[PDB]
């Protein structure tokens, strides 16, 4: 019964751990493509501000 | 959704970078020759005043 128990468990941890993979795997697609949205807004502020030459 | 927001605005970011590129093309063609008009007056000043010899 105890065997049982301990596989439950481990069953459950591993559909947990699957569900992070997941949320990574959704977060890299498009986290890339915002940080390079950022670098081109930073180049068009730059190119407007006089702040420096 | 978001995605499509991140889109819209790179967009609009695009369309003010081109037309500071526009304005940068109509000042560029007349600057310089402002400049040269101004060396052209200093030379015309320069030998109508008595200013040194």
């Not at 439950?8 to 986290?31: G, P, V, Y």
Request: proline content about 0%; glycine content about 6%; overall charge positive.
């Amino acid at each position: 019964a105890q065997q049982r128990t301990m596989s439950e468990n481990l069953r459950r941890n591993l559909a947990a751990l699957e569900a992070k993979i997941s949320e990574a795997k959704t977060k890299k697609n498009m986290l890339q493509a915002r940080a390079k949205a950022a670098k081109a807004n930073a180049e068009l502020q730059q190119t407007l501000g006089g702040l420096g030459t």
